[PDB]
UniProtKB/Swiss-Prot annotation:
Assigned protein family: Belongs to the PPR family. PCMP-H subfamily.
Region named Type DYW motif: 23-117
Gene expressing this chain: DYW1
Subunit structure: Interacts with CRR4.
Function: Plays a major role in single RNA editing events in chloroplasts. Acts as a site-recognition transacting factor involved in the edition of the site 1 of ndhD (ndhD-1 site corresponding to cytidine-2), which is a plastid-encoded subunit of the NADH-plastoquinone oxidoreductase. The interaction with CRR4 is required for its function in editing the ndhD-1 site.
Misc remark: Unlike other RNA editing factors, DYW1 does not contain identifiable PPR repeats but does contain E(+) and DYW motifs. Therefore its association with CCR4, which lacks E(+) and DYW motifs, but does contain PPR repeats, is required for its function in RNA editing.
Disrupted-gene phenotype: No visible phenotype under normal growth conditions, but the mutant plants lack editing of the ndhD-1 site.
Compartment annotation: Plastid, Chloroplast
Lineage of source species: Eukaryota, Viridiplantae, Streptophyta, Embryophyta, Tracheophyta
Protein name: Pentatricopeptide repeat-containing protein DWY1, chloroplastic
Type E(+) motif: annotated span: 1-22
Length: 117
């Protein structure tokens, strides 16, 4: 209930981050979203990938510059990998996403996996 409030705050930050990461050169690859829905809804479906929501929550919940550490039991999709790389170029935080195979260390617009995962 109050946890729904934490989610709400993450979705709000995500919208903000979405605009800035777009300004930084992120272009959402919506050809991936296999639903008979409009382009805006497809872009929202990608923005709402849970690793983005968890990163947005980490950013509002921690002091500026704090390393963000997110764990996802599933592989990070190509679109999230691009989004988080670009976010790491404009947010002065190390962002670490642990997926099913590795620790993706996003720093300064690069990932430690070299985009091969
Ligand atoms: Zn889907
Ligand atoms: Zn994704
Ligand atoms: Zn990576």
């Amino acid at each position: 209930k109050k946890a729904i409030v934490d989610r709400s705050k993450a979705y709000v930050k995500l919208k903000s981050l979405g605009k800035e990461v777009r300004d930084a050169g992120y272009v959402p690859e919506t050809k991936y979203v296999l639903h008979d829905i409009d382009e805006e809804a497809k872009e929202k479906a990608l923005m709402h990938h849970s690793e983005r929501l968890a990163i947005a929550f980490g950013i509002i919940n921690t002091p500026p510059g704090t390393t963000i550490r997110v764990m996802k039991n599933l592989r990070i999709c190509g679109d999230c990998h691009n989004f988080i790389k670009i976010l790491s170029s404009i947010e002065d935080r190390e962002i670490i996403v642990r997926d099913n195979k590795r620790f993706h260390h996003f720093r300064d617009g690069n990932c430690s996996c070299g985009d091969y995962w």
